[PDB]
């Protein structure tokens, strides 16, 4: 960075020019230049440049990414006074707590709401259960009741969590990374209702974000589910719309995820005291947030005094009400496993590829413990434990297994095609003489439209070796490139030294004639 | 397969003649999508009496349960479709079949306010 100046990164979908305007007032009062940038994919650029010791002094992002930044020591701890904290709602400070330390200033509160077309539906439904009957009426007039993104679990979570689902359990100031709540009775009930909506044709499993927004903004559907970032496009569409509390399910509030847009101070910044003065005395004021909100709406805000003004707008009152009934997104790194696990579960349940129970059972284990890893779209790697979990194999679309062991059972014959490679995990086993047969089996399943799960006992030596051999042969790459590729995706792989020898010998066999092209 | 998918769509959409054409050309009247939903399920849910009739005439399973436990009688009872319910029963629909919540068609009709149909179902065992 650079001393005596402040550099701020904030996403391009935010009021960055209102923020820049607050910086100019700071510069006018102090002489301290403030520069606001909005790089593409800044949430990925930040961890790279900040580990160097560069990047912005201040980064704005939803609080959930900030736990990962704080794990890598990329964010400075802040210690605002109790008199300052009391200016903000207590739950927003909770969202920026990591390992007992505050690591950002809360700014705004973001939650999904029910957006409805007042001309098609002057009185929006209080419950999810009445939406099928509403869709019957509207279909009779060439419209539909409800379209929203079914591809991303962020958007289906409010229904799934309503009756008791949750991501990670919080207790005693800490998330329990092994207590996931995606396969409890409440989550099953919510996803079961979502599947009923789809299988009965009230919604289409292929509706994504763009499809739902276009249909609502063209007056084709009476309702959507979306956040404050979408209001501008609706404003342009001139649809006469309202924003309200989400429907209940079994009488329980829908429980959307809550994101707190937050301002973290780079641990490498030489301007930490300046950043704190800017954030506490300039941004987190009625006038500062008003300047940002004018540019692009923040939704609800963390500052009590300004939230009370903004809440006169019912769209913002509704955002805050849905947030009160929601669940703060856990800020722990294990959430990346959660998002992938639950994304797969919802897509599989919405397409009928898995039952609700099996989809959520697989996602539960994936999020709380681990699971088989994708190597290529048709090739997956894991353990004998995974080979006993039909729900976890089905979740990946597995149609065939290579059992690379002498002892491990085949649990599901007649559901999957099995291939046996009977070798031991030791220095005497000749695994390379099975390479061609394994590769031919993988390609055979691949070209029939299937997917292969390769496993051993631990999924770290015999099965990893077969996957490495497949990659080297199919892509004409060296051991070191394939190994790094697989290690990146299943970090515990560790082929025994004899297998590594046999793979290096295979490498010179695969590439012996490659230098001519 | 291909025709089965078109028959499912036409049964949902209420396209009488398309249903008949697809059936004449070999569409499985017991076709299933990934939810185990059949054309008779969709015709009953969406209120297409004539499509329900022709499907049953040519061998649609009146007691098929989809992957979630719903029978066609369950789906018709949700909306109080008395004509459809009557022809389902005539073809042997089981009034006592239970969905995934343990509810019969009678319970389902009350749960959606169709108590005129509940009164008729109550006299049946």
Numbering used by the authors:
A (entry chain A): 3 to 519
B (entry chain B): 12 to 136
Paper text:
Dual-specificity phosphatase 1 (DUSP1), also known as MAP kinase phosphatase 1 (MKP-1), is composed of a kinase-binding domain (KBD) and a catalytic domain (CD). To investigate whether these MBP-specific DARPins can also help to promote the crystallization of MBP fusion proteins, we tested the two MBP-specific DARPins off7 and mbp3_16 (DARPin 16) in concert with MBP fused to cata­lytically inactive DUSP1 CD (Cys258Ser). For the first time, we have demonstrated that high-affinity MBP-binding DARPins can be employed to facilitate the crystallization of an MBP fusion protein. The DUSP fold is virtually identical in all of the structures of the DUSP1 CD, indicating that the presence of MBP and the MBP-binding proteins did not distort its structure.
The maltose-free or ‘open’ form of the MBP-DUSP1 CD fusion protein was crystallized in complex with DARPin off7, while both the maltose-free and maltose-bound or ‘closed’ forms of the fusion protein were crystallized in complex with DARPin 16, yielding a total of three different crystal structures. The crystals of the DARPin 16 complexes contain one heterodimer per asymmetric unit in both crystal forms, whereas the crystals of MBP-DUSP1 CD in complex with DARPin off7 contain two heterodimers per asymmetric unit that are related by twofold noncrystallographic symmetry. DARPin off7 has three (N3C) and DARPin 16 has two (N2C) designed ankyrin repeats inserted between the same N- and C-terminal capping repeats. Although DARPin off7 has previously been crystallized in complex with MBP, until now no information has been available on how DARPin 16 binds to this target. The structure of MBP-DUSP1 CD in complex with DARPin 16 reveals for the first time how this DARPin interacts with MBP. Surprisingly, even though the amino acids in the designed regions of DARPin 16 and off7 appear to be dissimilar when their sequences are aligned, the two molecules bind to the same site on MBP and adopt remarkably similar poses. A structural alignment of the two DARPin–MBP complexes reveals six conserved residues that emanate from different locations in the amino-acid sequences of the DARPins yet occupy the same spatial positions at the interface with MBP. Hence, this binding paratope, which is primarily hydrophobic in nature, was obtained in two separate directed evolution experiments with DARPin scaffolds having two and three designed repeats, respectively. On the other hand, in the crystal structures of the MBP-DUSP1 CD in complex with DARPin 16, helix α1 residues are occluded by a crystal contact with a neighboring molecule, rendering these crystal forms less advantageous for crystallographic fragment screening.
